[PDB]
């Protein structure tokens, strides 16, 4: 299930380290980031092994780190235990898709 309403109750969980729309909290902003270059926002500064990892948020890249963040990227400063079911993250990411 790809639903963006039931996308916007899952977000949610990120709104308060995460804003979407230009504004860096203790995330960075996620607007667009289905596609988007890892370590990409210059402004917020990302973690060392963040930083060495490279390519882009692709959707498997996407629901790899949101099933676990800190055992995908070892050294990473999201402190997110993860989603297990799959209708979470497929739901979450068409609404990163919905706000690019
Ligand atoms: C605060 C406790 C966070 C929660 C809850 C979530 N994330 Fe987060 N996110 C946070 C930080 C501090 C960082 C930076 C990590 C680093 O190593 O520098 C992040 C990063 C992400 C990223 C990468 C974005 C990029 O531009 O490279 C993604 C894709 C991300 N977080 C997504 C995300 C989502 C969708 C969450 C809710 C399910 C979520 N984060 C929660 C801090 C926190």
């Keep these: 299930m790809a639903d963006p309403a039931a996308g916007e109750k ?13 504004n860096d909290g203790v995330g960075p902003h996620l607007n667009g980031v289905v596609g988007r270059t890892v370590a ?9 092994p963040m930083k060495a990892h490279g390519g882009d948020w692709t959707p498997e890249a996407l629901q790899e780190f949101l099933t676990n ?31 690019q």
Aim: proline share 4%; net charge positive; aromatic share 10%.
């Design 10 to 22: 899952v977000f949610g969980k990120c709104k308060a380290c995460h804003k979407l729309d230009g």
């Design 40 to 48: 990409g926002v210059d402004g917020f500064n990302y973690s060392d």
């Design 69 to 99: 963040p800190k055992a995908v990227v070892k050294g990473t400063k999201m402190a997110f235990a993860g989603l297990p079911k799959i209708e979470d993250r497929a739901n979450l990411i068409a609404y990163l898709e919905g706000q």
